[PDB]
Symmetry: C2
Subunit: 470 residues, 2 copies
Amino acid sequence: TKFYTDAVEAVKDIPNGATVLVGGFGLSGIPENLIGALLKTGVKELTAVSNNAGVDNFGLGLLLQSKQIKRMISSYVGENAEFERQYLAGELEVELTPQGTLAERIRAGGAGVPAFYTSTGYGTLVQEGGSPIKYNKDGSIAIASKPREVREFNGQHFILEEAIRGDFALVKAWKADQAGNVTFRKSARNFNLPMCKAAETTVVEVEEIVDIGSFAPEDIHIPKIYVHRLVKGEKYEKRIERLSVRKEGDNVRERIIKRAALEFEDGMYANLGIGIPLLASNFISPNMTVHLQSENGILGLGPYPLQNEVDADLINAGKETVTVLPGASYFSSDESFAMIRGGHVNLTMLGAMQVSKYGDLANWMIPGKLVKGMGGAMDLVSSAKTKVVVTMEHSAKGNAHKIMEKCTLPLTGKQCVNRIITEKAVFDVDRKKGLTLIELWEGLTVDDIKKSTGCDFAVSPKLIPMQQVT
Amino acid sequence: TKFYTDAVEAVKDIPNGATVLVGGFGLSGIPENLIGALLKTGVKELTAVSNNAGVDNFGLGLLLQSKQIKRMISSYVGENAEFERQYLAGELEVELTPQGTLAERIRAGGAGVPAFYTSTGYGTLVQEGGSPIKYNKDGSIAIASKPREVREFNGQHFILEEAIRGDFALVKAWKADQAGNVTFRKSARNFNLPMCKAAETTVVEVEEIVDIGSFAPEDIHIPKIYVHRLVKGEKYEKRIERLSVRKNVRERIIKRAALEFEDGMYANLGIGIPLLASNFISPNMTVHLQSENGILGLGPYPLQNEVDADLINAGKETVTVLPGASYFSSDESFAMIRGGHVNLTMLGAMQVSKYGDLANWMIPGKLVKGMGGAMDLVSSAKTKVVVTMEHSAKGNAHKIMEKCTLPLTGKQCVNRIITEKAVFDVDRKKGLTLIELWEGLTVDDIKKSTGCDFAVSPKLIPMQQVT
Ligand SMILES: [Cl-]
């Protein structure tokens, strides 16, 4: 490992046009000093492999604002108006990549695996192609993503994804010893770890350079062999995107929140989406133990931090400062998604704009109105073994159906939803039997459900009035 | 995580014919207790996925002695006479699997990856098929391995290896916290970590259960979500297969091999001469030795007090690590190797072809212990592969020849050959180039001890020898 004292010296040789892996998830784990240096070198036209787009004035956002980036390979790019201006204006190329796929392709890139198969994105634009990479002002797609090869394995459909390997990786890490061994802090690891093994030249900025021996050899996140250039970052602002602090909705939403709260079981491993699902976790019995997995690489999310617990290195997938409970673990983004795709999470519960009779889900894109990427959603619904539960208002305004024979909006996955909870009904979803109404909100009739549902459903002989967590 | 107090209880539901992933590298990180429990359940016809089969009377060897294993899916038999005996006799079925591939397939097994490509095995019996899986009592082959699909990516050939998922995984770990989180010690991690995410039911035995909070969240090697059943091991014998403590033409090869080392180099030294050549490295030079079983920073043999059964080198010998070393899982280790992150791979060979083919793992009906990590170690073009070996075999039979006659380890993967008589550079296209020649010997001498033509370096020098 070569050590530098000046951030600019370590990145001075990044070529214009370089593919640079930029660590970070939201504003967490971002190499702000290496980004600052690229600001000073002015290296142009980069292909930034970065999970998110930081925000307007931080992280990748700073390089977007100075227009140093030509292409983003990311999973979620909301909260950056300049990014959205560039993307919508057609000034920026963006490959919306399933977070888990991004993590795994990066890993493959450092592990000598040219390509591998995954269930994520099967039956969506990722597999089908057509995801907009570069737009024209007019709203039409200039560059469309290409399909991924589909292949059958053990009766299921997977798609071939290829390794991502950068010219440089700008890695934000916590510490490095003088040998070049590196470790990451809390959820700040996310993509930094796998990115550090997947570039011709990896550049790591650390908050601290420490002596050799500082680390237990078993606990070196990234072995010195992967660390080519190491610099101690000069300035750390550690911006916090969404300060969510706790101190010591309407009835429709309240009702969905209260029924979803009933999906939790003890010892359950669950991943909860932003909004209602996370809120439903608020109604988990103190008697029940539910381990919340955060795709940004956390197992054991806790409630929002008290003012004194606020930590820019610890945020949930919703990018809110969080805490973790006892016995929690942090892992890289690639491990997180191996855990998710492998079906290790028992329950995944998320919002949706549409759900189909047999489990298709649509919750990441609204052609022309909502194009911020799918984050980890396609990976979350990719495993047959994980029970996926959708929580959403039953119908759209003017009673337009959200539950239908088939979704009209871009799919997050196919035959992946196992249950839907609305304020009027609870349906079990089976890829073979279809929709089965198993709960009906009191006051409403099966007929009321029929005129607010766009497909038919079996009515379970065990159909009960809709429950609410107490 | 469900905690058990009795190992039999934790595995009594394994059916006969179940595929079971068994952690361990040689005798390091083996699930002695879970294996002992299987001796009791008497579950038979097992397909055991394990790097090695331990030794004759320990580790997986026990289930071989008891004929409870119908089939081993391993990378190296090693010094297990019975394992070898059974394989050659036509009793035990064995899929010799490249160690690095064994590891990546297990990881894929828990990561939702049904299959992935790797360069390891390309051009060998692994990719081609024909690797004997099961022998006929009369020496012939009853079951041969099937061929793996080949696919090219970015100018290179790779083979398709499918995920390995077990019905059960018998995993050895160092500690578990009360929540189910698990950590490994030194090199005993090896295959235990990935096998722990790739089975319908993982059964982890630890040497210790600690309190939740005992681990720093960032340092839990195996998050609780993956540990279905956890039991604290009843008995740990800490057996050590090879106790290597510390207190000539072969030497010519070693002394020249020692000159391949450069400062800041990351290297993987094969058994014998290569490992020996590392003794001649200048203290003023920093060379980092990577061990396939999951170590970076190998040190010298341990003094008596330094001996640790959880820290052995690839040759199954007790070793130490130098400051700033690291440990990581077998799949990580091979991600590291397969990823070309190791600068120098130096190993022995029975044969090397004109263009770099290497044959170092099999000899029909006599050498059938498997390839170990060798096919993986020579799989990366970015890594410099140096073969150190005696120039000729008994009766001056050639070892450097046009085409190897022995099963290949790698196709066009050798960059240089150091023998006692010469040093040749090897190019996958132009062939051999004698760049160094032992004094007192002539190019004619070399000519008659080499089965094929070679170029002579216009700057050929007497063969150097580390001082
Ligand atoms: Cl081995």
